[PDB]
Protein backbone atom coordinates (compact mmCIF):
# COMPACT_ATOMS: atom_id res chain seq x y z
CA UNK A 1 0.00 0.00 0.00
CA UNK A 2 1.16 3.62 -0.38
CA UNK A 3 3.90 4.69 2.05
CA UNK A 4 1.84 7.68 3.25
CA UNK A 5 -1.87 7.64 4.15
CA UNK A 6 -4.04 10.68 4.92
CA UNK A 7 -7.76 10.67 5.73
CA UNK A 8 -9.74 11.85 2.69
CA UNK A 9 -11.83 14.25 4.76
CA UNK A 10 -11.65 15.97 8.14
CA UNK A 11 -14.15 18.28 9.83
CA UNK A 12 -13.31 20.52 12.78
CA UNK A 13 -14.89 23.35 14.76
CA UNK A 14 -13.97 27.07 14.46
CA UNK A 15 -11.65 28.34 17.19
CA UNK A 16 -10.70 24.78 18.09
CA UNK A 17 -7.71 22.79 16.88
CA UNK A 18 -7.55 20.61 13.79
CA UNK A 19 -5.31 17.56 13.93
CA UNK A 20 -4.36 16.32 10.47
CA UNK A 21 -2.62 12.96 10.29
CA UNK A 22 -0.07 11.52 7.87
CA UNK A 23 0.32 7.85 8.73
CA UNK A 24 3.46 6.03 7.60
CA UNK A 25 2.99 2.38 6.67
CA UNK A 26 4.47 -0.36 8.87
CA UNK A 27 8.11 -1.08 8.09
CA UNK A 28 8.72 2.66 7.86
CA UNK A 29 9.41 4.41 11.19
CA UNK A 30 7.97 7.94 11.58
CA UNK A 31 10.88 8.70 13.90
CA UNK A 32 13.20 8.48 10.88
CA UNK A 33 11.49 10.92 8.50
CA UNK A 34 11.14 14.67 8.09
CA UNK A 35 7.45 15.42 7.42
CA UNK A 36 6.67 18.27 5.00
CA UNK A 37 3.25 19.92 4.75
CA UNK A 38 1.63 21.86 1.90
CA UNK A 39 -1.72 23.67 1.77
CA UNK A 40 -3.76 24.10 -1.40
CA UNK A 41 -6.84 26.26 -1.95
CA UNK A 42 -9.03 26.11 -5.09
CA UNK A 43 -7.56 27.76 -8.15
CA UNK A 44 -4.15 28.26 -6.60
CA UNK A 45 -0.76 26.49 -6.41
CA UNK A 46 0.23 24.56 -3.27
CA UNK A 47 1.82 26.62 -0.49
CA UNK A 48 4.64 25.24 1.66
CA UNK A 49 3.56 25.37 5.34
CA UNK A 50 6.30 23.80 7.46
CA UNK A 51 8.32 20.68 8.14
CA UNK A 52 8.83 18.72 11.34
CA UNK A 53 11.43 16.09 12.22
CA UNK A 54 11.76 16.67 15.96
CA UNK A 55 11.24 19.41 18.55
CA UNK A 56 14.86 20.40 17.89
CA UNK A 57 14.56 20.19 14.12
CA UNK A 58 11.61 21.88 12.48
CA UNK A 59 11.00 25.03 10.46
CA UNK A 60 8.11 27.25 9.47
CA UNK A 61 7.41 28.26 5.89
CA UNK A 62 7.82 31.96 5.10
CA UNK A 63 4.66 33.91 5.95
CA UNK A 64 2.92 30.97 7.63
CA UNK A 65 1.24 31.93 10.94
CA UNK A 66 2.27 30.15 14.15
CA UNK A 67 -1.28 28.72 14.31
CA UNK A 68 0.19 26.02 12.06
CA UNK A 69 2.64 23.65 13.75
CA UNK A 70 3.96 20.14 13.27
CA UNK A 71 4.35 17.14 15.52
CA UNK A 72 4.62 13.34 15.50
CA UNK A 73 2.56 10.60 17.10
CA UNK A 74 4.93 7.68 17.66
CA UNK A 75 2.29 5.16 18.76
CA UNK A 76 0.24 5.86 15.63
CA UNK A 77 3.39 6.08 13.46
CA UNK A 78 2.09 9.37 12.12
CA UNK A 79 3.20 12.90 11.36
CA UNK A 80 0.74 15.60 12.45
CA UNK A 81 -0.22 19.03 11.20
CA UNK A 82 -1.90 20.98 14.01
CA UNK A 83 -3.95 24.10 13.26
CA UNK A 84 -5.03 26.16 16.27
CA UNK A 85 -7.54 29.02 16.30
CA UNK A 86 -9.20 27.42 13.28
CA UNK A 87 -10.63 29.98 10.86
CA UNK A 88 -13.11 29.48 8.00
CA UNK A 89 -10.32 30.55 5.63
CA UNK A 90 -8.35 27.43 6.65
CA UNK A 91 -10.69 25.27 4.53
CA UNK A 92 -8.29 23.74 2.00
CA UNK A 93 -6.58 20.52 0.91
CA UNK A 94 -3.52 19.59 2.94
CA UNK A 95 -0.78 17.31 1.60
CA UNK A 96 2.00 15.70 3.56
CA UNK A 97 5.24 14.55 1.93
CA UNK A 98 8.46 12.77 2.77
CA UNK A 99 11.66 11.97 0.91
CA UNK A 100 12.01 8.22 0.68
CA UNK A 101 14.60 6.30 -1.35
CA UNK A 102 15.45 9.46 -3.38
CA UNK A 103 11.83 10.23 -4.25
CA UNK A 104 9.36 12.85 -3.06
CA UNK A 105 6.35 10.87 -1.83
CA UNK A 106 3.08 12.76 -1.40
CA UNK A 107 0.13 11.68 0.74
CA UNK A 108 -3.26 11.62 -1.01
CA UNK A 109 -4.36 14.84 0.69
CA UNK A 110 -6.98 15.68 3.31
CA UNK A 111 -9.82 18.07 2.54
CA UNK A 112 -10.51 20.10 5.68
CA UNK A 113 -14.03 21.36 6.38
CA UNK A 114 -14.55 23.96 9.10
CA UNK A 115 -17.92 23.33 10.81
CA UNK A 116 -20.59 25.79 11.91
CA UNK A 117 -21.24 27.55 8.60
CA UNK A 118 -24.87 28.80 8.45
CA UNK A 119 -27.45 27.55 5.97
CA UNK A 120 -27.87 29.91 3.03
CA UNK A 121 -30.37 30.04 0.17
CA UNK A 122 -29.14 30.29 -3.41
CA UNK A 123 -29.08 33.60 -5.26
CA UNK A 124 -30.29 32.92 -8.78
CA UNK A 125 -29.76 35.00 -11.91
CA UNK A 126 -31.33 33.89 -15.19
CA UNK A 127 -30.36 35.30 -18.61
CA UNK A 128 -32.35 34.81 -21.84
CA UNK A 129 -30.67 34.14 -25.22
CA UNK A 130 -28.71 37.08 -26.65
CA UNK A 131 -29.75 38.67 -29.95
CA UNK A 132 -26.40 37.59 -31.34
CA UNK A 133 -26.93 33.92 -30.42
CA UNK A 134 -30.45 33.93 -31.86
CA UNK A 135 -29.02 35.33 -35.11
CA UNK A 136 -26.69 32.30 -35.20
CA UNK A 137 -29.81 30.08 -35.03
CA UNK A 138 -29.15 28.95 -31.46
CA UNK A 139 -30.59 29.80 -28.05
CA UNK A 140 -29.19 29.16 -24.57
CA UNK A 141 -30.83 30.09 -21.25
CA UNK A 142 -28.22 30.65 -18.54
CA UNK A 143 -29.09 29.99 -14.89
CA UNK A 144 -26.38 31.09 -12.46
CA UNK A 145 -26.64 29.94 -8.84
CA UNK A 146 -24.47 31.31 -6.04
CA UNK A 147 -23.85 31.68 -2.31
CA UNK A 148 -25.73 28.60 -1.11
CA UNK A 149 -24.86 26.31 1.80
CA UNK A 150 -24.62 23.32 2.24
CA UNK A 151 -23.35 22.50 -1.26
CA UNK A 152 -26.25 20.65 -2.85
CA UNK A 153 -29.01 21.88 -5.17
CA UNK A 154 -31.29 20.40 -7.78
CA UNK A 155 -32.34 22.31 -10.90
CA UNK A 156 -35.47 21.89 -12.99
CA UNK A 157 -36.67 23.87 -16.00
CA UNK A 158 -40.16 24.78 -17.20
CA UNK A 159 -41.49 25.93 -20.55
CA UNK A 160 -44.54 27.90 -19.51
CA UNK A 161 -45.87 25.39 -16.96
CA UNK A 162 -44.48 22.18 -18.49
CA UNK A 163 -41.30 20.37 -17.38
CA UNK A 164 -38.39 20.47 -19.85
CA UNK A 165 -35.76 17.75 -19.43
CA UNK A 166 -34.11 17.74 -22.87
CA UNK A 167 -31.21 20.09 -23.52
CA UNK A 168 -30.39 20.64 -19.84
CA UNK A 169 -26.75 20.64 -18.65
CA UNK A 170 -26.08 21.36 -14.96
CA UNK A 171 -22.80 21.51 -13.06
CA UNK A 172 -21.99 19.88 -9.76
CA UNK A 173 -21.78 22.46 -6.98
CA UNK A 174 -18.30 23.86 -6.39
CA UNK A 175 -16.88 25.72 -3.40
CA UNK A 176 -16.56 29.49 -3.79
CA UNK A 177 -13.72 31.53 -2.29
CA UNK A 178 -16.12 32.53 0.50
CA UNK A 179 -16.71 28.83 1.33
CA UNK A 180 -20.27 28.90 0.04
CA UNK A 181 -21.19 27.10 -3.18
CA UNK A 182 -21.90 27.90 -6.81
CA UNK A 183 -23.46 26.02 -9.70
CA UNK A 184 -24.92 26.76 -13.09
CA UNK A 185 -27.47 25.25 -15.43
CA UNK A 186 -27.87 25.74 -19.18
CA UNK A 187 -30.96 25.03 -21.26
CA UNK A 188 -30.38 24.69 -25.01
CA UNK A 189 -33.34 25.57 -27.23
CA UNK A 190 -34.06 26.38 -30.86
CA UNK A 191 -34.96 30.02 -31.60
CA UNK A 192 -38.40 28.74 -32.61
CA UNK A 193 -38.88 27.00 -29.25
CA UNK A 194 -37.74 30.13 -27.43
CA UNK A 195 -40.20 32.34 -29.34
CA UNK A 196 -43.16 29.95 -29.11
CA UNK A 197 -43.61 30.07 -25.33
CA UNK A 198 -44.77 32.88 -23.05
CA UNK A 199 -41.86 32.18 -20.72
CA UNK A 200 -39.23 29.76 -19.41
CA UNK A 201 -38.28 29.23 -15.77
CA UNK A 202 -35.20 27.98 -13.95
CA UNK A 203 -36.18 26.39 -10.62
CA UNK A 204 -33.50 25.83 -8.02
CA UNK A 205 -34.29 23.64 -5.04
CA UNK A 206 -32.16 23.75 -1.89
CA UNK A 207 -33.07 22.16 1.43
CA UNK A 208 -36.66 21.50 0.34
CA UNK A 209 -37.40 25.08 -0.74
CA UNK A 210 -37.29 26.49 -4.26
CA UNK A 211 -36.30 29.74 -5.94
CA UNK A 212 -37.65 30.26 -9.47
CA UNK A 213 -36.62 32.88 -12.03
CA UNK A 214 -38.50 33.53 -15.26
CA UNK A 215 -37.52 35.10 -18.60
CA UNK A 216 -39.57 35.84 -21.71
CA UNK A 217 -38.97 36.57 -25.42
Amino acid sequence: QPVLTQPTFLSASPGASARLSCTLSSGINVGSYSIFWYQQKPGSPPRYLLYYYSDSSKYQGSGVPSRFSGSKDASANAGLLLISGLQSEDEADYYCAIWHNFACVFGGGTRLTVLGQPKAAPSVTLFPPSSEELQANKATLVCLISDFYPGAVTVAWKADSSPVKAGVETTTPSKQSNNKYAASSYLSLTPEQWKSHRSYSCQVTHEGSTVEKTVAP
Binding site: P46, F127, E132, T140, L144, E169
Partner: protein
Protein backbone atom coordinates in the same frame (compact mmCIF):
# COMPACT_ATOMS: atom_id res chain seq x y z
CA UNK B 1 11.96 38.13 -4.46
CA UNK B 2 12.30 35.54 -7.23
CA UNK B 3 9.13 34.70 -9.17
CA UNK B 4 8.37 31.90 -11.60
CA UNK B 5 6.55 32.73 -14.84
CA UNK B 6 5.24 29.50 -16.29
CA UNK B 7 4.32 28.90 -19.96
CA UNK B 8 0.67 28.44 -20.91
CA UNK B 9 -1.92 25.64 -21.08
CA UNK B 10 -2.60 23.64 -24.22
CA UNK B 11 -3.65 20.40 -25.91
CA UNK B 12 -1.39 17.58 -27.13
CA UNK B 13 -2.22 14.51 -29.21
CA UNK B 14 -1.21 11.16 -27.71
CA UNK B 15 2.44 10.21 -28.53
CA UNK B 16 3.60 13.84 -28.71
CA UNK B 17 6.16 15.43 -26.40
CA UNK B 18 4.99 17.82 -23.68
CA UNK B 19 7.21 20.89 -23.45
CA UNK B 20 6.87 23.51 -20.71
CA UNK B 21 9.12 26.34 -19.61
CA UNK B 22 9.36 28.56 -16.57
CA UNK B 23 11.06 31.97 -16.73
CA UNK B 24 12.65 33.14 -13.48
CA UNK B 25 12.27 36.86 -12.80
CA UNK B 26 13.48 39.09 -9.98
CA UNK B 27 16.84 37.33 -9.82
CA UNK B 28 18.97 34.44 -11.07
CA UNK B 29 18.16 30.83 -11.88
CA UNK B 30 21.64 30.08 -10.47
CA UNK B 31 23.03 30.34 -6.96
CA UNK B 32 20.28 28.45 -5.19
CA UNK B 33 19.71 24.76 -4.50
CA UNK B 34 17.53 23.60 -7.36
CA UNK B 35 14.26 23.50 -9.25
CA UNK B 36 11.55 20.93 -9.84
CA UNK B 37 8.28 19.99 -11.49
CA UNK B 38 5.13 18.64 -9.84
CA UNK B 39 1.82 17.75 -11.49
CA UNK B 40 -1.81 17.31 -10.47
CA UNK B 41 -4.51 15.62 -12.56
CA UNK B 42 -7.87 17.45 -12.25
CA UNK B 43 -9.57 16.51 -8.96
CA UNK B 44 -6.60 14.37 -7.86
CA UNK B 45 -3.49 14.73 -5.71
CA UNK B 46 0.07 15.98 -6.21
CA UNK B 47 2.78 13.92 -7.96
CA UNK B 48 6.44 14.93 -8.07
CA UNK B 49 7.99 14.57 -11.54
CA UNK B 50 11.61 15.42 -10.86
CA UNK B 51 14.19 17.90 -9.65
CA UNK B 52 17.41 19.43 -10.95
CA UNK B 53 20.24 20.70 -8.74
CA UNK B 54 22.06 23.93 -9.49
CA UNK B 55 25.59 23.21 -8.27
CA UNK B 56 26.03 19.98 -10.22
CA UNK B 57 23.37 20.05 -12.92
CA UNK B 58 22.46 16.59 -11.61
CA UNK B 59 18.87 15.38 -11.83
CA UNK B 60 16.60 13.15 -9.75
CA UNK B 61 13.47 11.94 -11.54
CA UNK B 62 10.39 10.10 -10.31
CA UNK B 63 11.40 6.52 -11.17
CA UNK B 64 8.01 5.75 -12.77
CA UNK B 65 8.52 8.62 -15.23
CA UNK B 66 12.32 8.60 -15.64
CA UNK B 67 12.36 7.04 -19.12
CA UNK B 68 10.20 9.88 -20.48
CA UNK B 69 11.36 12.97 -18.51
CA UNK B 70 14.01 15.62 -19.22
CA UNK B 71 14.45 18.59 -16.87
CA UNK B 72 17.03 21.23 -17.74
CA UNK B 73 17.96 24.86 -17.27
CA UNK B 74 19.34 27.48 -19.61
CA UNK B 75 21.29 30.15 -17.73
CA UNK B 76 21.34 32.64 -20.62
CA UNK B 77 17.53 32.65 -20.75
CA UNK B 78 17.12 32.28 -16.97
CA UNK B 79 14.76 29.45 -17.88
CA UNK B 80 13.71 26.06 -16.50
CA UNK B 81 12.33 23.39 -18.85
CA UNK B 82 10.41 20.13 -18.63
CA UNK B 83 9.99 17.69 -21.49
CA UNK B 84 7.84 14.59 -21.18
CA UNK B 85 7.81 12.25 -24.16
CA UNK B 86 5.20 9.83 -25.53
CA UNK B 87 2.25 11.33 -23.68
CA UNK B 88 -1.08 9.61 -23.11
CA UNK B 89 -4.35 10.67 -21.48
CA UNK B 90 -2.81 9.64 -18.13
CA UNK B 91 -0.54 12.69 -18.45
CA UNK B 92 -3.42 15.21 -18.51
CA UNK B 93 -2.68 17.43 -15.49
CA UNK B 94 -1.86 20.85 -14.20
CA UNK B 95 1.94 21.02 -14.25
CA UNK B 96 3.76 23.32 -11.80
CA UNK B 97 7.36 24.48 -11.77
CA UNK B 98 8.88 25.15 -8.35
CA UNK B 99 12.05 26.38 -6.68
CA UNK B 100 13.64 23.82 -4.38
CA UNK B 101 15.22 24.84 -1.07
CA UNK B 102 17.41 22.52 1.00
CA UNK B 103 17.20 22.21 4.76
CA UNK B 104 19.68 20.80 7.25
CA UNK B 105 17.95 18.31 9.54
CA UNK B 106 19.83 16.01 11.99
CA UNK B 107 21.32 13.07 10.08
CA UNK B 108 20.53 14.36 6.59
CA UNK B 109 19.82 17.30 4.33
CA UNK B 110 16.25 17.36 2.97
CA UNK B 111 14.38 19.73 0.68
CA UNK B 112 11.04 21.38 -0.05
CA UNK B 113 9.19 23.29 -2.75
CA UNK B 114 9.45 26.87 -1.59
CA UNK B 115 8.11 28.89 -4.52
CA UNK B 116 5.63 27.75 -7.20
CA UNK B 117 4.58 28.82 -10.68
CA UNK B 118 0.85 29.30 -11.33
CA UNK B 119 0.38 25.98 -13.13
CA UNK B 120 -0.36 25.02 -16.73
CA UNK B 121 -3.12 22.58 -17.58
CA UNK B 122 -1.87 20.27 -20.33
CA UNK B 123 -4.60 18.11 -21.84
CA UNK B 124 -3.80 15.01 -23.87
CA UNK B 125 -6.63 14.02 -26.19
CA UNK B 126 -7.58 12.85 -29.69
CA UNK B 127 -10.16 15.64 -29.82
CA UNK B 128 -9.29 18.89 -31.62
CA UNK B 129 -9.01 22.31 -30.01
CA UNK B 130 -12.12 24.45 -30.39
CA UNK B 131 -12.27 28.12 -29.45
CA UNK B 132 -15.37 29.48 -27.69
CA UNK B 133 -18.23 31.49 -29.13
CA UNK B 134 -18.75 34.47 -26.83
CA UNK B 135 -22.14 36.16 -26.36
CA UNK B 136 -23.06 39.18 -24.25
CA UNK B 137 -25.59 38.81 -21.43
CA UNK B 138 -27.25 42.23 -21.19
CA UNK B 139 -28.16 43.74 -17.78
CA UNK B 140 -29.30 49.39 -7.45
CA UNK B 141 -26.89 46.71 -8.52
CA UNK B 142 -27.39 45.18 -11.96
CA UNK B 143 -25.99 41.87 -13.22
CA UNK B 144 -24.49 41.56 -16.70
CA UNK B 145 -22.23 38.93 -18.13
CA UNK B 146 -20.75 36.88 -20.92
CA UNK B 147 -21.60 33.40 -22.10
CA UNK B 148 -18.58 31.42 -23.26
CA UNK B 149 -20.00 28.56 -25.29
CA UNK B 150 -18.66 25.28 -26.70
CA UNK B 151 -14.88 25.20 -26.25
CA UNK B 152 -12.20 22.57 -25.70
CA UNK B 153 -10.01 21.92 -23.73
CA UNK B 154 -9.99 23.83 -20.46
CA UNK B 155 -9.09 26.44 -19.33
CA UNK B 156 -10.74 29.75 -20.15
CA UNK B 157 -10.04 32.89 -18.13
CA UNK B 158 -12.33 35.92 -18.05
CA UNK B 159 -11.50 39.43 -16.91
CA UNK B 160 -13.58 42.58 -17.19
CA UNK B 161 -12.45 45.90 -18.66
CA UNK B 162 -8.94 44.51 -19.19
CA UNK B 163 -8.66 43.54 -15.53
CA UNK B 164 -9.52 46.98 -14.17
CA UNK B 165 -12.88 45.73 -12.91
CA UNK B 166 -12.63 42.98 -10.28
CA UNK B 167 -15.22 43.90 -7.65
CA UNK B 168 -18.46 41.95 -8.03
CA UNK B 169 -17.06 39.63 -10.72
CA UNK B 170 -18.03 35.95 -10.49
CA UNK B 171 -16.72 33.59 -13.13
CA UNK B 172 -18.47 30.22 -12.80
CA UNK B 173 -16.87 26.80 -13.18
CA UNK B 174 -17.54 25.35 -16.63
CA UNK B 175 -20.10 22.72 -17.44
CA UNK B 176 -18.92 19.70 -19.41
CA UNK B 177 -21.67 19.03 -21.93
CA UNK B 178 -22.62 15.61 -23.28
CA UNK B 179 -20.97 16.72 -26.55
CA UNK B 180 -17.62 16.78 -24.76
CA UNK B 181 -17.31 20.55 -25.10
CA UNK B 182 -17.28 23.04 -22.23
CA UNK B 183 -19.32 26.20 -21.61
CA UNK B 184 -19.00 28.76 -18.81
CA UNK B 185 -20.37 32.15 -17.86
CA UNK B 186 -18.95 35.18 -16.09
CA UNK B 187 -21.20 37.70 -14.36
CA UNK B 188 -20.36 41.10 -12.90
CA UNK B 189 -22.58 42.99 -10.49
CA UNK B 190 -22.38 46.77 -11.00
CA UNK B 191 -24.19 49.94 -9.90
CA UNK B 192 -27.33 50.30 -12.02
CA UNK B 193 -26.86 54.08 -12.08
CA UNK B 194 -23.55 53.62 -13.94
CA UNK B 195 -25.03 51.71 -16.89
CA UNK B 196 -25.52 54.69 -19.21
CA UNK B 197 -22.00 56.07 -18.80
CA UNK B 198 -19.74 53.11 -18.03
CA UNK B 199 -18.60 50.70 -20.75
CA UNK B 200 -18.39 47.01 -19.83
CA UNK B 201 -16.29 44.56 -21.85
CA UNK B 202 -15.58 40.94 -20.98
CA UNK B 203 -12.16 39.66 -22.04
CA UNK B 204 -12.28 35.94 -22.70
CA UNK B 205 -8.96 34.18 -23.19
CA UNK B 206 -8.72 30.61 -24.45
CA UNK B 207 -4.98 30.06 -24.61
CA UNK B 208 -5.15 26.50 -25.94
CA UNK B 209 -6.54 27.95 -29.21
CA UNK B 210 -4.48 31.21 -29.09
CA UNK B 211 -7.77 33.08 -29.21
CA UNK B 212 -9.06 35.94 -27.10
CA UNK B 213 -12.39 37.70 -27.51
CA UNK B 214 -13.35 41.05 -26.01
CA UNK B 215 -17.13 41.41 -26.04
CA UNK B 216 -18.89 44.70 -25.32
CA UNK B 217 -21.90 44.14 -23.08
CA UNK B 218 -24.60 46.81 -23.26
CA UNK B 219 -28.12 47.46 -21.95
Amino acid sequence: QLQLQESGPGLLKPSETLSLTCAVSGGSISGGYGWGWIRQPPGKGLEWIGSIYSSSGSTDYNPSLKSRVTISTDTSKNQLSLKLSSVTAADTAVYYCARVQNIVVVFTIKEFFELWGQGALVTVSSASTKGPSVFPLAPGTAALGCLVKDYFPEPVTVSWNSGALTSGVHTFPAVLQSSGLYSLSSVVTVPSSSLGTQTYICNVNHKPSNTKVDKRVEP
